[PDB]
Amino acid sequence: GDDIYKAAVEQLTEEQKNEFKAAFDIFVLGAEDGCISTKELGKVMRMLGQNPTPEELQEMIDEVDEDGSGTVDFDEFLVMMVRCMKDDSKGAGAGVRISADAMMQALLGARAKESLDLRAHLKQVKKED
């Protein structure tokens, strides 16, 4: 199905998975299976400086969830995170819109912005201002 994104997570550079991992640590802090559920996610969404609803919190979860159980694993995270910044996840219809870089800024900081994606160095990089 989403082989593009599914495989994309693997195409990423060492710096990508490395930085992304540093965030997942805190993102899935306390989770049952180190995943990102409505609770683990809702805690981050608000940490950025917002306050979403519980009904919507589940939406985004399953929206990216591969199993559709209500959680997001490592790969599943990169699958949506890889397109997050690209703005090619699903669309920008409703006002709601979560950014990848923004989130990282909370988990870690600016480290996951300029010195995040190493692909820009030599590897190909599309939709990357």
Of 18-26, 60-68, 104-112, 116-124: span binding ligand BQ6 (CB under 6 A): 60-68
Residue 50 as a binder of ligand BQ6 (CB under 6 A): the answer is yes
Alpha-carbon gap, residue 38 to 57, rounded angstroms? 5
x/- mask, ligand BQ6, residues 67-106, rule CB under 6 A, reads -----x-------x---x----xx-----xxx--------
- Closer residue to ligand BQ6 (CB): 28 or 117: 28
Residue 9 as a binder of ligand BQ6 (CB under 6 A): the answer is no
What b/e sequence results for 38-68 when a residue is b if at least 16 CB atoms lie within 10 Å of its CB, and e otherwise? bebbbbbbeeeeeebeeeebbebbeebbbee
Q: Are 100 and 84 in contact (CB under 8 A)?
A: yes
Size of the site for ligand BQ6 (CB under 6 A): 19
Of 1-9, 13-21, 57-65, 110-118: span binding ligand BQ6 (CB under 6 A): 57-65
Alpha-carbon gap, residue 124 to 54, rounded angstroms? 38
Alpha-carbon gap, residue 14 to 118, rounded angstroms? 8
Residue 2 as a binder of ligand BQ6 (CB under 6 A): the answer is no
Q: What does the block give as tokens for 85? A: 């910044």
Name the site residues for ligand BQ6 (rule: CB under 6 A). 36, 41, 45, 50, 52, 56, 59-61, 63-64, 72, 80, 84, 89-90, 96-98
